[PDB]
Amino acid sequence: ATNRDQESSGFAWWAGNARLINLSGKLLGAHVAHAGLIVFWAGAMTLFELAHFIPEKPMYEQGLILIPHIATLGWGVGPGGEVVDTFPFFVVGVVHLISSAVLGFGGVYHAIRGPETLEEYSSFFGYDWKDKNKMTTILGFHLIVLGIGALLLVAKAMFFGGLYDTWAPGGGDVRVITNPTLDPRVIFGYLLKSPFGGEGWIVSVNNLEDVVGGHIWIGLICIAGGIWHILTTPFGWARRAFIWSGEAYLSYSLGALSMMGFIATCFVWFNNTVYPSEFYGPTGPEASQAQAMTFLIRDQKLGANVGSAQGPTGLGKYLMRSPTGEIIFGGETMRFWDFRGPWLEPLRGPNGLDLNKIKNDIQPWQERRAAEYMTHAPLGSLNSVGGVATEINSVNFVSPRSWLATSHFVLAFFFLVGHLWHAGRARAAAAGFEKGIDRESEPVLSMPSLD
Amino acid sequence: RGWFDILDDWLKRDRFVFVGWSGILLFPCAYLALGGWLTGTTFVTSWYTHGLASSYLEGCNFLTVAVSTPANSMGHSLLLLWGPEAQGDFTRWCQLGGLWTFIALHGAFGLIGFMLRQFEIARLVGVRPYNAIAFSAPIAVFVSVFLIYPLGQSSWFFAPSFGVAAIFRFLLFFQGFHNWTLNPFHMMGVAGVLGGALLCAIHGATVENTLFQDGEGASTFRAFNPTQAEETYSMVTANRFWSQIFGIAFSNKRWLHFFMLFVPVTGLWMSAIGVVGLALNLRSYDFISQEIRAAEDPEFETFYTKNLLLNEGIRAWMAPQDQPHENFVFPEEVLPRGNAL
Amino acid sequence: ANLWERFCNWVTSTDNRLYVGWFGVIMIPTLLAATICFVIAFIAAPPVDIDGIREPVSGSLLYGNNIITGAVVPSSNAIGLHFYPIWEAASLDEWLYNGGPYQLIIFHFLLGASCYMGRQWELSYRLGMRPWICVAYSAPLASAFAVFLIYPIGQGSFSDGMPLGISGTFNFMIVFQAEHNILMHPFHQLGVAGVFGGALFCAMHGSLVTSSLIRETTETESANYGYKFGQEEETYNIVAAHGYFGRLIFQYASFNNSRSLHFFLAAWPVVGVWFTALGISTMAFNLNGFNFNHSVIDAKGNVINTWADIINRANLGMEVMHERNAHNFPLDLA
C-alpha cells in the first residue's frame, strides 16, 4: 500500500485522488478509466434512445439529445429531417459502447496491476510536472489529435455524405459542402463580432460553409501549433508568468472548460444552424416569433389589415419598427427581432418584413411550421410538464435546448469554482504556505502598521 | 435527602440523552408535535375544512402534504378532543382540524421546554445562558405567527398550515393582501437573516484561510487539539486582510462573536413586531402621497403602483378557492386582467 | 529601479491602507463610474420606458419617489440584448428615455465585483494566507450575475433583469414567481435552507462562544475588554462550549474541532447560495419548478384541489396583471 493512507500521503479519503499527483502509473489508469466512462455513456444512452425511439414523433417530443447529435451529421435522415434509417444510430451506439470495454480494460490494468510510476518503465512515457520540455510535448501530441478530429468533421462534410442543411433551398435536406469558406476576413470575422444582441459573436453562424471552413482553419492551426510546442521550450516571459506544477495545469483546464461551458449553453439556446430546430425544437426567440406569425395569419384570414392595425399602446398590434427602422413583429417579441429562421426568411425583404409578401406569399407549410413551433416553446417544469408555469398537467414535454443549456451552465459554473479553488492552491503550494501560517515566521508581523 | 432530591439526582444523570426537569415538559410535548404532524401528513385529510387533499393516502407528495388549519366556522376554538366540537370522537376530531391545534399547542409548550433545557444544562455545566437568550428569537417568531396573528384575525383558518406547499401559500397571501414586502419590519428581518448568513460564511472562511501550520499534512483538520491553549488562526493577519480589502475589520474576538449573536436575533425580533401589526391589518400597504399623485395623473407610474396591480390580481384569483367559507362567485367580467393574457 | 518597477512595487504594495493590486487597477475606475452614475440617476433621472411600449416609469427622487419606491429603471424592451452605450444614441435625452444608465451601471458593476473577487485572492497571496476566501464570495457574486446578466440572456432582453431599487426588486420577485414558480424549485429551497441555516448557525456559533468566555473582566466593565488584540491565548473555552452543546442534543452531534466547525460555518451558507444562483440561472432557460396542477383526481374524474392548486391561483393573479399593456397574444412565452 504505497501512498494509500493519510500518514504516508497527507491526504484524507475525501481528497484521496490527490495521492496520484506523483504517481504517473496509477494516474494514467485514472484518466484512461474515466475516458472509458465517457464512451460508455455515449454508447449506452444512444441504445437507450433508440429502443425508446418513435419515428413518427419529433425528436424534441421524446427527450433525445444524442440522436439529434447524430441526425445533424447527416446519418439516418432524409428531406426535412425525417428519419429514414435508424441503423446508423444503432452503429454509433454499439461501436462507442464496445470501445468502452477496451478503454476500461486498460484503465483497470494501469491502475492496480501496472507499475505505479512510469519513470521506471519508459523515459518516453514517464514525465515530471516541472519538466517544461516534456509537458509541452504531451500538449503538442494531444493538439495534433484534436486537429485531426477537426479535419474528420470536414471529411464527413466534403467526402462522406455531407451534413444536414436546414437552410437548404426547398426545405431541409442532407447536402455535401463543396466550397468551404477559406476567407480569413469571414472566418476570423466571427471572433471579432460583439457578443451582444444583433451580433452574437460566433453563435450567429448561419451556414455550413462558414462552419466547415472554420474547422479547416482550426485543424491546421492545431497541427502547426502542435509541431511548434513539440520542438520548442517555453520562453522566459512565460516561465516567470505561470506556475509550473501539476495542480496548476489542471486549474488552467478547469478555467478553459468552464469558459467553453458557457459558450455551448448559448450555442444551443440561440443558434438553430448547427442545432437544427427539426431535432432540438425551436429556440426561445424562434417560438416567440412563431406566435406573432400564427395570429398574423389567423386575423388576416378574417380580413384584418395587419399593416394598419394599431395596438393599445400606439405601436402596431402585428408589425412595428426596430430601433434602426427594420419592420418587425409587434408585441413583446420586439426583443426577438434578431431571429433568423428558414421558415421566416421568405417573408423578409430589404427593409424587413414585406407587407406585400405577407398578404399574398404565405404558404400552408409556413403556417404549419409556425403553429408547431409555437406550441413547442422551450417552456416546462422540472417534472416535464409542457407549457407556462400556470399550465395544467397534460403535455409531457421539456425542450432539449432547455435540458442542454441548463445542464452545461451548472457544469460551467462549478468548473469555474474549480479554477478558483485549484489555481489559488497552486499559487499557495508553490510558494510554500498552503498548510497554514508559520507561527515563528508570520509575514504580517514583519510589516508596518496601516495607521 | 428526600424523594424530591432523589428524583432530582436521577433526572440530572449523565447519560446519552440528558433528561432533566425540563425533560418532563420537553420530551412528551416535542414528541407529540412531531408525531402529530407525521400522522396527519400521511393519513388525515383536509377535504371538510379546506376542500383539499393533504396526505400521502389521498395522493400527495412530500411537497404538498399538510396539516391544514381548522375551518373558519370554528373561530378561535381550542378544538380539544373532549371539547364540545369533537365530542370525544377521534375521527370527527381529525375531520374538523383538531390536529392543527394539537400540533400548535403541544409545539408551543415544546419550545418552552427546549428553552428551559438550555437554561438547565448551562447551569449544571457552569456556562452563561446566551444560547437560551438567543433562542428567544425563534420563539418570538412562532408565537407571533402561529398564535398572535390568527387570534387577531377571524379564526385559526388564516394561520399557517403545517405543510411545505401550504407555507408557500402563506407567503403569497401576505404579499397580495398585506403587502408584507413593503413593511419596514420585514425589511429589518431580511437584513438580519441575510446579514446573519453573511457573518456565518465570512467568519468561517476567514478562520480557515488564516490558520496556523500546526501539522504537516495537507488536510489541516488534524492540526487542532481541543485542550490546546493557543489560537488556531491568526487574528492579526485576518485583521490586516479585511482592513485593506474592505476598509474596516474586527479587532476583538469577544465583540465579533457577540456581533454574530445580535444580527440574526434582532432581525427575527423586528419581523415579529411587524407580524403582530398584521394581526390587526395594520399594514404598510400604501404611500398616501403616491396615491394622491397617481389618482390625478394618469401618466405618473412607479414600481410602487405596478406592485399594487399585482396585489389586486392576487386577491381576485385565489380568494374564491382559498376562502371557500365566504362563498365568493366572481364572473369572468369582473376579474382584473391585462391585455391578451 | 526604473519607472515600471517602482510603479509595480506601489500597486502590489502591502503597506497601502486600501490595497490596490492589479485586479484593483480595473476595479477602481469601473466601480467609481457605476457609483457616480447610480447616485446621479437615483436622484435626477427622467422616466424610462422599460417595457418598450412608450409607457415610461418614473424612477428618480426628483420625479416623485422615495427611498422605498425609487429605482434606476432597466433598459427598454425594444433594445433587448443590444449593447446601448452613450455614443450609440443621438442625444442624452434619448439615452435617458430608453434606459441607458442601467446598462452602464450593471456592466461596470459586474466588472468591478469580478475584479473585487480576484482582489481578495491577491491580498491573500501577498500576506501568506490561504486564498479560498474569494471562493465564498463567488456565491453572492454569482447571484448578482444571475439576476443581472444570465436571466436577461435567457429571456432575450435586459428589461427583464432585476431593477435597481427597493420596490423594483419586489417586482422582480413576484414576476419570477408567476412565470417560473420559483418557490416550488428545489434549488431556491436549497437557497432558503442556506440563508435560514446560516442565520441559525451564525446565532448558534455566536451564542456558544460568548457563553464560554473566560472571566477576565468584572461586572462594571464590558466583557470585550477581556480580549487583547494579538494575544496568543484563546479567549473562550471550546471544551466547555462542547460540554454544553454536547448535551443539548447528544455528544456526537457537537463539534470538538474548531477548524472543522468553522469550515461548516463557511460551507453551509455558501453551498446554499451557490444553488439558488444556479436556480435563477437554470430557470433563465425556462426549466421551472414543479408543476402539480390538477394532479389529484377522484375516482370519477373530478379535480381534488391541493395547496399546489391554490398557489396556481395566486400565480394566475400575478400572471394576468403584470405588464398589462405589453401583450397582444394569448401566450406569454418570454
Partner: peptide, 30 residues
Amino acid sequence: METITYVFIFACIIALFFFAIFFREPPRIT
C-alpha cells in the same frame, strides 16, 4: 423637503464611511 432629506441622510453616511476608515482607532499589538 423629501429629496433634500434623503440626500442629506445619504451624504452623512458616506461621510461616516470616510471617518470610520481613515480616522479609525488604530489596532495595536498591545
